[PDB]
Amino acid sequence: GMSNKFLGTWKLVSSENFDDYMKALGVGLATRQLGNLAKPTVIISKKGDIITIRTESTFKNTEISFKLGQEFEETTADNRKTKSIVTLQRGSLNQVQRWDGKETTIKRKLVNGKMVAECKMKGVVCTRIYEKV
């Protein structure tokens, strides 16, 4: 299953192209302004086979709980209502969100002890790097 090295608290230290990613999602200017200023913490936990990813920031908190390979209903930070799934590929924790005929992917992988989240939509690629705290 998911490597236990994902478990714990992560803090955003680098974000590239998040504004264009949010634009591709349909997020408006004022929300993007706050989104680009946010430096969230991400807490990854498990209980049995249920994995939880909680995102905390002054602007917005989100939490998803899921079993690998089982579709679930998600309410994203920008209030999209998506059908989502998380699965593993070579140790990468890969999330897909589908709504209104659209799709975005968030792939979270460990690289030299950091957590790297690659966010993709409509040819837009955003990379967010987290330090373990």
Ligand SMILES: CCCCCCCCCCCCCCCC(=O)O
């Ligand atoms: C709490 C994150 C930033 C808040 C800005 C809300 C605008 C919509 C953002 C949706 C995409 C969030 C993807 C996060 C990827 C990650 O965990 O690094």
